[model samples]
Target: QLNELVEFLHSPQPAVRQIAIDNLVGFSAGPTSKVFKNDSYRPIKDIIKMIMDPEHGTRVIIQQGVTILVNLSEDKLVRNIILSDDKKFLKFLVWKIVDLTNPNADIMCILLSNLAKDDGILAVLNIKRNSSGEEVDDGLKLAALNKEVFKSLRAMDCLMDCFVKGYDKKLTKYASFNYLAFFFADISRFKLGRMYFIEEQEYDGVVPISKLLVFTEKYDAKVRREGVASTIKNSLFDSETHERLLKDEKINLLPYILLPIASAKDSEIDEEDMFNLPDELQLLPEDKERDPIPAIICCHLESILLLCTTHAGREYLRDKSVYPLVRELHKNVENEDIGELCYRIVNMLMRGEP
Candidate 1:
């Protein structure tokens, strides 16, 4: 029946070929679930290649292929095999979505995530050669690590455009944004991808690290803020990238992280918290939303402040009155959590004097 479906590929009728593709997909799970196993997945590759063929695959056909690929990928062995040779199929899938013309953008993001799920595969996605003649690992053979497979993909530029520019020109996939952030973080875990970030990439230009820093001001959705923070945090592991952020010259986040009691009366709080805070100065510990941000972002802000404690970052913060604003915040913070962090941070900044 699988081979019969392949013969249907040469069908003159577009609708017939679509049904054939759909029926092949159905094998994974549906009315007729024979879904291949182990080495039997060899036919799955044929289905993908058929979909890749220009004459055979249409918009609907391509999307159908994506659905089938997504389903079959559930088997880890099948997934590893398919993506191990992703240079041919996976690369095509990425470039197709980059056009954003095929109308399966959401599905494509999921595909990228799934393909990326394997830690070893990330080393495959890296085009940049390693320094010091190192060998990439994590279940990957050195031969697989060296390839032009990911070269034409231009992943960063396309992903940034899709996410930053808009999923479709001003529309945003909030979940998708988080996954992309995590995806890059995962990529950065491998030395090859990590080097690409600090040595080869211009994040402040394409990625705008300052913009992500602004997100850490601790006032967005718990998850969304985490996404932005992860992107910055991954790259900041590099000392060069760390200073790149402090010296970016466009960055002025001193006022961003310290607020609402560190440098302000309850009335002086900025209105940037994801949701509204009480107008009056009432100590409502009962308010679950009182902090307006999850403790994670608060910690992230603290971490950034700690980063500022560096000789470069400290002097930079001092110029911004790091101690002065913190003292003001200690005097007038609205909540206990943030105010406490500010207090301890200020003590550290002022050499433990106050």
Candidate 2:
């Protein structure tokens, strides 16, 4: 069966070809162990040569081959292929993997992460060789100015639309809160535009807080509330330069800083526990129909109000005309969760302390 599958791998038909690849992937689950265990397949050299075949289904075949080798090959050999001084093959693999759109995204992400850990890969990533062999420090900068990032962002926007519009109801089943958590983790670590900024020797300001706010607002309401709370907390107490930067217009979080507060307080409140809330105040399906806005208001109010009380926060209100809008929110805080949060945040600004 294994020999027959290998023959089918060379078949002209696409359907037959895919089956061969699938079989190869399955057999290679134990990798070199399974290959060696079979008496008929004693020659590992031939298997390696077949996998390295230049013309026969190269990319997918190579991917499966590398996956098996990574699992079974000795540490030294793996290092030689993936982290050697001369990294032509590694670079080729990285570029290829980035373009793949399969369920293998997680696996590819892991591969990139491992490759990035090697200093050799980082060196190649930081340098750009032009047609004339001149090294360009501005490789990433040049890439950013091109349409690639914007195109990718736009594609993401379209996918978000499908979820928002309820066109892909099934997506909700797969959607997990941890998805955004993982995304934020990746963003914080990789620093997508970091290389460009470092090479240019320029400060591009803080990550776009407004964009994050908008993203939260458009997606899950619970996430929006949780994110706003966390962001405000981080801004006030965690980030040392946040106040100074906000005051300098180096980081403009004015719009986000101005959202209204929730008026309805929890009856069963624990003073020490920040996140815990009364069950009655929580948003439900019935509330969605009867009083949607207020439900949203209650969700984000506590954190916003907490941030507004600081001296630096008050400065934002006075400087940005945040006071008047907050006053309006105060009058109708019961209307929406966001409205309440805006009001509370502004009130805290006026009072100067929580």
Candidate 3:
């Protein structure tokens, strides 16, 4: 049965091809699904070829084929295979994405996001050839340590451009490319992604993070909000970047993280706590909705807490009156997790050395 579907994928009739592609999508969607498991049904390379063939695959065929690829890429073994052989599969995917012509580019973004899920794959995504002859972890770690390698491939630059301008602009009417946020956040799980976002300055001196910061309050998509929040929190791991992150006018990250966890009612806090609140937090609008997701709220607070890891950061948050906002959060936030984190941050602010 699976053999028949695999053969039908190459059928001359688009209708016949659609039937096969649709079945492949369903069969590959679940862990228990047989499309990938069947001995005679190795659709991995076939699907890749189908999507790559501009002449034969129709819009629906290409979209469903990419969907199947996205599903299969979820498995570690299959992901490894796709990224193997000199990254033949990854190169093709990135080409389609960078070209920004594939109508299924959004799905490809999801695919790239899935591929980056593995730490080993992340090393590869950031990998470059070493010339200094430093033998480290079979040279992979040494090569992967720099974001420049990833930038050299144009993958990082292309994705960042698509994110700002919109993905597949010609095909998409309202392309938010929200999953690219997830990809950014996922890569930021390690130093390579974080450094690029935090340190790589544009010709104008603004970092990629400054562009993404505004989305913390964007309520249209929870994934976008959560992804950006996570990216900011992850970037905070580099304690050396703390001072500039807070002080730089272009990337003053405090308000973006604070406003989500803050409320309009915060305006009513007492004189001492309110004394140093950043002007942005002083008179939040009445209709303001505290970030509805507790996880994202916790992430924002965690970002604040990471800043306190440095003594200067502690003093900065202190001078900025972060406590007043957190105090209100502790009093108002119903989630025990968020409440507990707020208490922790409050305790640190009250006693930590400045």
Best by TM-score: 3
lDDT of 1 by residue, 1-354 (tens): 565675564476777767887777666655343445434565566556666666666767777777877776666776776776545565555445444344666676666656665765564444332321223433222222112222222445445445444422343333234345445555655655555554424423433444444444344444445555555555555544455565554564333344322312243333343123222223333321323444653554465555555566665655454455455445554558767777667655665222
Report each candidate's C-alpha RMSD, comma-separated, in the order given: 10.1, 12.1, 7.1
- lDDT for model 2: 0.39
Q: Clashing residue pairs, candidate 1?
A: 261-329, 261-333, 262-329, 263-329
lDDT of 1 at 31: 39
lDDT (0-100) at residue 179 of candidate 1?
Answer: 47
CA RMSD (A), model 3 = 7.1
**Per-model TM values vs. the true structure:** 0.58, 0.36, 0.82
What's model 2's lDDT at 271? 39
Candidate 1 clashes: the total is 4
Stretches of candidate 1 off by over 4 Å are 1-17, 20-36, 71-78, 119-153, 171-179, 197-224, 251-354
Model 3 stretches with alpha carbons more than 4 Å out: 7-19, 37-41, 98-101, 120-153, 167-171, 202-204
Error of 1 at 222 (Å): 7.4
